Design a protein around this ligand. Structure first.
Ligand SMILES: *[C@@H]1O[C@H](CO)[C@@H](O[C@@H]2O[C@H](CO)[C@@H](O)[C@H](O)[C@H]2NC(C)=O)[C@H](O)[C@H]1NC(C)=O
Ligand SMILES: *[C@@H]1O[C@H](CO)[C@@H](O[C@@H]2O[C@H](CO)[C@@H](O)[C@H](O)[C@H]2NC(C)=O)[C@H](O)[C@H]1NC(C)=O
Ligand SMILES: *[C@@H]1O[C@H](CO)[C@@H](O[C@@H]2O[C@H](CO)[C@@H](O)[C@H](O)[C@H]2NC(C)=O)[C@H](O)[C@H]1NC(C)=O
Ligand SMILES: *[C@@H]1O[C@H](CO)[C@@H](O[C@@H]2O[C@H](CO)[C@@H](O)[C@H](O)[C@H]2NC(C)=O)[C@H](O)[C@H]1NC(C)=O
Ligand SMILES: *[C@@H]1O[C@H](CO)[C@@H](O[C@@H]2O[C@H](CO)[C@@H](O)[C@H](O)[C@H]2NC(C)=O)[C@H](O)[C@H]1NC(C)=O
Ligand SMILES: *[C@@H]1O[C@H](CO)[C@@H](O[C@@H]2O[C@H](CO)[C@@H](O)[C@H](O)[C@H]2NC(C)=O)[C@H](O)[C@H]1NC(C)=O
Ligand SMILES: *[C@@H]1O[C@H](CO)[C@@H](O[C@@H]2O[C@H](CO)[C@@H](O)[C@H](O)[C@H]2NC(C)=O)[C@H](O)[C@H]1NC(C)=O
Ligand SMILES: *[C@@H]1O[C@H](CO)[C@@H](O)[C@H](O)[C@H]1NC(C)=O
Ligand SMILES: [Zn+2]
Lengths: 604, 48, 48, 49
């Protein structure tokens, strides 16, 4: 019986899989912690040793046909193995593809632009070019950087991206998908569970249908920022047009965070910071992670584990014993978990601690599941938990209770706005950009945009959705979207949209369990065990269930909503509607920073 | 910018290597007045 | 090369960015045969 | 265009070791074009002063 056949094969697989994974992860941990040339190749040995096992099992598992299995939980693991991946290509093609991929990332990571005046000082992107766009207030300098990065690097990526599209499309069509676009939406798909189904085509409807409710709030937030930029760059921004693309804080415009210093509503009142009340009380980078653990215990979740305290990197070594401190949580499997981060006594690290312990508390939940079912219910559930845990540990109603933030301290309704607008510049600022970027790629990957209208459609959608106009016209020899990291490194970009929505659906559905009364942005789930159950019933599922059934166990619905995101920003929406009396909310997509010096030619 | 069937586009001129330096329009309107008779015959067009 | 009063110079064409790649003369002698009538009027000269 | 060559190492050893006509010509011309062209307006002032 095919059923039993597989059922036995999966069982035999699990052991080898788990042990090889353990040995493969330990190597990378030892490398990242202890940077030695010796450990570099050891990690590669273990990694390839593991990765070959996956290919062997994948081919070996292609025997059992899918449409016989009834036990859903095994039909789910098999689907993760039968996936042919990119092996379905040819040989020469498959090794041309890897060459293109390795050439595109190298250009992004090493390409450099340099000054017109002194052509000897060249600037990378990682340091230097970012800080120019993030700190400068000089119009001409920002424009020079913005244009030159797209000209001397975008122009290189164009003929490579044109080939990458073509190859990836064949790699997808040979897997019974329509194109690469339809391949990427393969993460949100559910099949045959009686009411929890979700077709790869519905994702477009949901994304385009929830975005029409953020447009009213984004329009006001956009019309307010524009009115505050006409004081920092006068005579450069017209008050009924879009915003020039290089005056948005970041090189691409993904986050508007770096516009805070120009747009702070009440500049006199300072925001809530406690980086100093920690020093006066002598908080080392171990009282932090104890406070985080205590916060998690208060909710109802379990303690940490001995191994966690033992073999982790809560502190920077300091000597030439070298390491990377990009803060990460590690799930080496077999029953140990460990964090890695060079902790500084600060506030933005007192939050990152809670964030990472969020991932860790996730992993400890589903660690009783078959190896292939150890992951978020979909791609946007992991980082949508770290957030809601770092979102409830920054509220004064919690800081004045952990010990910081002296008890005689009542917050006024002006720091509330000072804080909400700092949030909205990061949350709501990046929703239209993400939506537009993924729409463009979904439309390119299906030939709905001929290869000679790429940039034209790009800058046509920018002015219409995001409301951002370019400062110099870009013909078809450019490729601007390939200048972003995620685009020129082959990464899906829709997780950052749906994550933002889940992040608030969970937060809103948890405060009602903790019996909150006031506005949503002042909620705190601590000390409320009956709201730790509602969360623990979703973590303790891994991937064993369709993600809609996971959502139902917390929110009470079966689809992403956008109402809870608007209830969060209500006290800001009201104030903005009041501040935009004598302005023009919206924009007109014909203005352009160069349309007052251009001459029009007409030939017959 | 804005190439089209009618072939009616827009154009503007910047300094040699300074992307943020647009030559004011009332000087481009004079250089072209000076050399229009020589731009025309390069394409065989005739000022109409 | 060799600009002079008579204005008689020499010229040759290379690939876009490859200084060691000279387009053979018997192809420059054909492109110019094709577009001579359009090179002329750009200067108002007349093939003599 | 990502691998740039100084003169002190690299550009000297090309001219001193190669036997490839095109490579030598590329180096010889590019050093004079992307560096000579910069020194000209400075040398013109240096002479005068
Ligand atoms: C970092 O890695 C190096 C090796 O890359 C470790 O050096 C070893 O040190 C132990 C002493 O504890 C010796 O017995 C080994 O012979 C050393 N190995 C080599 C290759 O020299 C070093 O200990 C590691 N650092 C830490 C903190 O474990
Ligand atoms: C699908 O198969 C799994 C086995 O792979 C079944 O899980 C077993 O369930 C019984 C009783 O619930 C336990 O005693 C076993 O320990 C489980 N197996 C493992 C490996 O943990 C599961 O019940 C099957 N699904 C259905 C609907 O029957
Ligand atoms: C994965 O790729 C294989 C080809 O490498 C697909 O074709 C099957 O290959 C096996 C050999 O392992 C044959 O026994 C089958 O007859 C082939 N199927 C057909 C329809 O010809 C295989 O279908 C692919 N599987 C998936 C899930 O994409
Ligand atoms: C969770 O509840 C506990 C006890 O109900 C709180 O601990 C008290 O905190 C106050 C002020 O910090 C102290 O005066 C009490 O002595 C504490 N009691 C105990 C038993 O420790 C704790 O502050 C609450 N946490 C939050 C975030 O509200
Ligand atoms: C913060 O709350 C205070 C108190 O409610 C507000 O101050 C009053 O606002 C109303 C609304 O226009 C005025 O009619 C009163 O005259 C204000 N009182 C004083 C003493 O000035 C204040 O507007 C609120 N701030 C924000 C940003 O909402
Ligand atoms: C590019 O052109 C701009 C003019 O548009 C130059 O900017 C001027 O810079 C000087 C001193 O740096 C200022 O006094 C002027 O006010 C600037 N012009 C404007 C309109 O503000 C810029 O210097 C030029 N770039 C270079 C490298 O010379
Ligand atoms: C520049 O053009 C020359 C041709 O003049 C190219 O040199 C050829 O290179 C190939 C392989 O490298 C050889 O098989 C040919 O024999 C070479 N031509 C001659 C005439 O010997 C050179 O490759 C070009 N440069 C680049 C970067 O492509
Ligand atoms: C967690 O560990 C602490 C010791 O640090 C202990 O006091 C506490 O009781 C533990 N939690 C539970 C639920 O037992
Ligand atoms: Zn995280």
């Amino acid at each position: 019986t095919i059923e039993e056949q597989a059922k036995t094969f999966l069982d035999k697989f699990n052991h080898e899989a788990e042990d090889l994974f353990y040995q493969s992860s330990l190597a990378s941990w030892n490398y990242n912690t202890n940077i030695t040339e010796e450990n570099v190749q050891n990690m590669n040995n273990a990694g390839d040793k593991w990765s070959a096992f996956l290919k062997e099992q994948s081919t070996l598992a292609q025997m059992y046909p899918l449409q016989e299995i009834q036990n859903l939980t095994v039909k789910l693991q098999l689907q993760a193995l039968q996936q042919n991946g990119s092996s379905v290509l040819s040989e020469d093609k498959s090794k041309r593809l890897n060459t293109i991929l390795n050439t595109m990332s190298t250009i992004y990571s090493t390409g450099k632009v340099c000054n017109p005046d002194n052509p000897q000082e060249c600037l990378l992107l990682e340091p230097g070019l970012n800080e120019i766009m993030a700190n400068s207030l000089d119009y001409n300098e920002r424009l020079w950087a913005w244009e030159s990065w797209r000209s001397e690097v975008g122009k290189q990526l164009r003929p490579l991206y044109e080939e990458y599209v073509v190859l990836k499309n064949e790699m997808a069509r040979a897997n019974h998908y329509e194109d690469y676009g339809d391949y990427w939406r393969g993460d949100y798909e559910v099949n045959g569970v009686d009411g929890y189904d979700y077709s790869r085509g519905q994702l477009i409807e949901d994304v385009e249908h929830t975005f029409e409710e953020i447009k009213p709030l984004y329009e006001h937030l956009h019309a307010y920022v524009r009115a505050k930029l006409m004081n920092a760059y006068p005579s450069y921004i017209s008050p009924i047009g879009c915003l020039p693309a290089h005056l948005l804080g970041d090189m691409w415009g993904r986050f508007w965070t770096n516009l805070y210093s120009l747009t702070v509503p009440f500049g006199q009142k300072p925001n809530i910071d406690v980086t100093d009340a920690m020093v006066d009380q002598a908080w080392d980078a171990q009282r932090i992670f104890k406070e985080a653990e205590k916060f998690f215990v208060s909710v109802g979740l379990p303690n940490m584990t001995q191994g966690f305290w033992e073999n982790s990197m809560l502190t920077d070594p300091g000597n030439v014993q070298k390491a990377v401190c990009h803060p990460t949580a590690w799930d080496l499997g077999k029953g140990d978990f460990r964090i890695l981060m060079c902790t500084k006594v600060t506030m933005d690290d007192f939050l990152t601690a809670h964030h990472e312990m969020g991932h860790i508390q996730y992993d400890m939940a589903y660690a009783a599941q078959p190896f292939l079912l150890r992951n978020g219910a979909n791609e946007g559930f992991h980082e949508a938990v770290g957030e809601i845990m770092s979102l409830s540990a920054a509220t004064p109603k919690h800081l004045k209770s952990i010990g910081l933030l002296s008890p005689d301290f009542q917050e006024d309704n002006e720091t509330e706005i000072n804080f909400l607008l700092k949030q909205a510049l990061t949350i709501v600022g990046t929703l239209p950009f993400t939506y537009m970027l993924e729409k463009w790629r979904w439309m390119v990957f299906k030939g709905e945009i001929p290869k000679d209208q790429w940039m034209k459609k790009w800058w046509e959608m920018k002015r219409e959705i995001v409301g951002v106009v370019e400062p110099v016209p870009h013909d078809e020899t450019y490729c601007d979207p390939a200048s972003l990291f995620h685009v020129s490194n082959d990464y899906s970009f829709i997780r950052y949209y749906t994550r933002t929505l889940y992040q608030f659906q969970f937060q809103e559905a948890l405060c009602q369990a903790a019996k909150h009364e006031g506005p949503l942005h002042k909620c705190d789930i601590s000390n409320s065990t009956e709201a730790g159950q509602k969360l623990f019933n979703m973590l303790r599922l891994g991937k064993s269930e369709p993600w809609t059934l996971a959502l139902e166990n917390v929110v009470g619905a079966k689809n992403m909503n956008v109402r809870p995101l608007l209830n969060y920003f209500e006290p800001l929406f009201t104030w903005l509607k009041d501040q935009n009396k004598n302005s023009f909310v919206g924009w007109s997509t014909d203005w352009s920073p160069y349309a007052d010096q251009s001459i029009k030619v007409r030939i017959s | 910018a804005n190439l089209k069937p009618r072939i009616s586009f827009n154009f503007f001129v910047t300094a040699p290597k300074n992307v943020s330096d647009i030559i004011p329009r009332t000087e481009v309107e004079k250089a072209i007045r000076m050399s229009r008779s020589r731009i025309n015959d390069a394409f065989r067009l005739n000022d109409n």
